[PDB]
């Protein structure tokens, strides 16, 4: 008879309006991971600041992200022209996931992209276009290297600034507002999550309702849903833990975001 909800004791706001609006982002090879934690998510309020987006969610459906918890929400905000907007999927790679910003083979969370035909392309080009080009290591997923090099392919090892079999990288677009469209840049706002770990940080919006521990419930322990009987727990959790399993997929005991009492569940 009882449909409780156990979402974390926050009342933070999260700093999304200081990443979307911003003035400049970064450059393709050197993005900024910006922390998002212990704050409310209200993702329902999102389509004023930068509309025209793709929201291309390889994983929590779009009007989900208000409906569960989350340990750690990183975005990476940068400029890619209009070329790898989906091929920064985990499939494609090439020049933009090897030698740039790389997603890995299997990946949670959504990316956010916007045109930028008048408001970021400049007069000559703003030059904050450099991609690493070509280097010897294919990335690893969510890895940069902030360096340059004089790549060669090999023949006479040579470190000079010299085009000609010295082959200098970090390289870079820019122009008057018009071109041949197919330049024109995108501003790119990533949003990697992750579940499960510690005691989740970003919750979104709190319904928290008080515990009833001898009798059946329908329970929402930080996102998770449940039918079954919460009751007191005579188990040795460890702090750091969070929930408790069996022999199956199910979980069978769980600790709450408040007042930290392990509570075993059964059906
Ligand atoms: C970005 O900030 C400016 C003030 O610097 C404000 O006028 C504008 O509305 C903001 N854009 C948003 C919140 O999308
Ligand atoms: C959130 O919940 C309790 C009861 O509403 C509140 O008094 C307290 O500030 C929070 N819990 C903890 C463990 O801080």
Redesign the pocket.
């Known amino acids: 008879t009882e449909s409780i909800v156990r979402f974390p004791?926050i009342t933070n706001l999260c700093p999304f309006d200081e990443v979307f609006n911003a003035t400049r982002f970064a450059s393709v090879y050197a993005w900024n991971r910006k922390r998002i934690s212990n704050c409310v998510a209200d993702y329902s309020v999102l389509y004023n600041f930068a509309p025209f987006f793709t929201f291309k969610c390889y994983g929590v459906s779009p009007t989900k992200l208000n409906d569960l918890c989350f340990t750690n929400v990183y975005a990476d905000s940068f400029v890619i022209r209009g070329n790898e907007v989906r091929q920064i999927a985990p499939g494609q790679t090439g020049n933009i996931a090897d030698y740039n910003y790389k997603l890995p083979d299997d990946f949670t969370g959504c990316v956010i992209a916007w045109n930028s035909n008048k408001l970021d392309s400049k007069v000559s080009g703003n030059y904050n276009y450099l991609y690493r080009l070509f280097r010897k290591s294919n990335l690893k997923p969510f890895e940069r290297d902030i360096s340059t090099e004089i790549y060669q392919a090999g023949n006479k090892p040579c470190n000079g600034v010299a085009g000609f079999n010295c082959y200098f990288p970090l390289r870079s677009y820019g122009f008057r507002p018009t071109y041949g469209v197919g330049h024109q840049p995108y501003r790119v706002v990533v949003l990697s999550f992750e579940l499960l770990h510690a005691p989740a940080t970003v919750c979104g919006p709190k319904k928290?309702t008080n515990l009833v521990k001898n009798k059946c419930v329908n329970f929402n322990f930080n996102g998770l849903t449940g039918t079954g009987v919460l009751t007191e727990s005579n188990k040795k959790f460890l702090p750091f833990q969070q929930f408790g399993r069996d022999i199956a997929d199910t979980t069978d005991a769980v600790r709450d975001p408040?007042?930290?009492e392990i509570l075993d569940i059964t059906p």
Do not use: A, C, V, Y
Request: glycine content about 0%.
């Open positions: 004791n928290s408040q007042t930290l």
